Amino acid sequence: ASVTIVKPIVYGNVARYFGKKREEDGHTHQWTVYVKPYRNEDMSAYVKKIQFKLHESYGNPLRVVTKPPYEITETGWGEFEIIIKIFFIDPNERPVTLYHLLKLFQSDTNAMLGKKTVVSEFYDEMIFQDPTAMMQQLLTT
């Protein structure tokens, strides 16, 4: 490739326990799943939208976020895999797919260190090889 652009990202989730099981629906946790840049940039320059596919137990399980922050906050009772798909401003630039296990329950290791939220997050890089002129400009602004 003549131009290679690497965009580091962090994705995953945070979760917080209610201290009790809610009577109405059995929900125990609030959680937020997200994708963010690793560096301080405006990702929307080159990201068109990010889609998050939730478990079928959720209403409207295919969620779309079109502007930063690219996050979904929900409540629930169970862990499950979320599929994340990142679309670019050039429709012909192949979207990126990420796989994340939504984490609710804290390790004893972290509990004993006084952590009161669960954070499960992962570093990755999106790699663009010879993107269009328009994409190159927006990736480098």
């Binding site: 690497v6 979207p95 990126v96 797919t97 990420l98 796989y99 890089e125 999106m126 790699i127 090889q129």
Partner: peptide, 11 residues
């Protein structure tokens, strides 16, 4: 675009 990491196993 492609990613650095595989789908379900990461460095």
């Amino acid at each position: 675009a492609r990613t650095k990491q595989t789908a379900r196993k990461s460095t």
